[PDB]
Amino acid sequence: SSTILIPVVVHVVYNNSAQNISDAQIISQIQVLNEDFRRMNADQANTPSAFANLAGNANIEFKLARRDPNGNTTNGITRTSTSTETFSMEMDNVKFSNLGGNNAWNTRRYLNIWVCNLGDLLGYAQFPFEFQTKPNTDGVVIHYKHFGRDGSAESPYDKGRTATHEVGHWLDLRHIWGDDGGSCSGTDNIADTPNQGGYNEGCPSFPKTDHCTNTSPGVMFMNYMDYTYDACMNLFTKGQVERMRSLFDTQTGIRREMQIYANELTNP
Ligand SMILES: NCc1cccc2nsnc12
Ligand SMILES: [Ca+2]
Ligand SMILES: [Ca+2]
Ligand SMILES: [Zn+2]
DSSP states (O other): OOOEEEEEEEEEEESSTTTSOOHHHHHHHHHHHHHHTTTOOGGGGGSOHHHHTTBOOOOEEEEEOSBOTTSOBOOSEEEEEOSOSSOOTTTTGGGOGGGTSOOOSOTTTOEEEEEEOOOOOOEEEOOGGGTTTOGGGOSEEEEGGGSSBSTTOOTTSOBSHHHHHHHHHHTTOOOTTOSSTTOSSOOOSOTTSOOOSSOOOSOOOSSOOOSSSOSTTOOOTTBTTSOOOGGGOOBOBHHHHHHHHGGGOTTTOTTTHHHHSHHHHHOO
């Protein structure tokens, strides 16, 4: 497979000094996305051998924009002082300059990552099916305490995996347990993710079983699309990789336009 290139702009929207996170912290997150989406994450050593053969390399590269929407030079990082103290998922106010946030850069050409103070919410995504109706709010929001790996990020969500999970949703992946409140009925529509009752939290011991997969090697609680601690997640499946890449299909791909100028938007 050929590398899919994603131009990124990180909108730091800060009401105080703590929210105005460091360049190092932002570069740390860009690096984590590149590791997790190219299976160059060192904690792939924690992937059980039973699931190692299902492990996907998405071969998606994330580069900070070097050309802004007016065609001027940028480092792909915006900093917006805000009078708003906590942002709302329901309002999407972080995504509008008009409401004390920062307007999206053309969502057909850039992945917009908003960093801000959110309401015990780690972050939220918008799914591709919503793009036609909600073009301005396409992208990913991350809580400033859970952006980037180590540094200023707070345990136990301190390895940058909130953004990996949210970019997952942004590329059309569903919760591995099927958003069915614990049943075996719901599906993530991925053949190589074992059927799973409910979400996992914390760091379960391998193997974790439930009424849906009651046998070793159990459910893939170390999948990025579960709700487990950052240090206890370490793969996408080949099935998940195919779903994500299909959005960039040159004929039918919802996000295909992103590839046309990706190189020019990320090259000096
Ligand atoms: N572990 C990934 C993740 C992303 C977003 C919200 C979450 N709640 S708990 N785990 C989450
Ligand atoms: Ca599945
Ligand atoms: Ca389920
Ligand atoms: Zn989720």
